[PDB]
């Protein structure tokens, strides 16, 4: 139930984590987080390692 976020912004590179029971819930949380950090970017999703990647 853990999901990662890989931030590749023009001035913001990093990775965060959250615990969510649904991929859309996790995506929404990460999108909110990204937006608060100024990002949103092109969003890619890997379901093998449960990671969302943002390419600004």
From Swiss-Prot:
Transmembrane segments: none annotated. It is found in: Secreted, Cell wall. Sequence repeats lie at residues 3-56. It comes from the Bacteria. This is Immunoglobulin G-binding protein G. It comes from Streptococcus sp. group G. The lineage of its organism: Bacteria, Bacillati, Bacillota, Bacilli, Lactobacillales.
């Amino acid at each position: 139930m853990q999901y990662k976020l890989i931030l590749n912004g023009k001035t913001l590179k990093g990775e965060t984590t959250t615990e969510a029971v649904d991929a859309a819930t996790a995506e929404k949380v990460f999108k909110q987080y990204a937006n608060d950090n100024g990002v949103x970017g092109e969003w890619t999703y890997d379901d093998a390692t449960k990671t969302f990647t943002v390419t600004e």
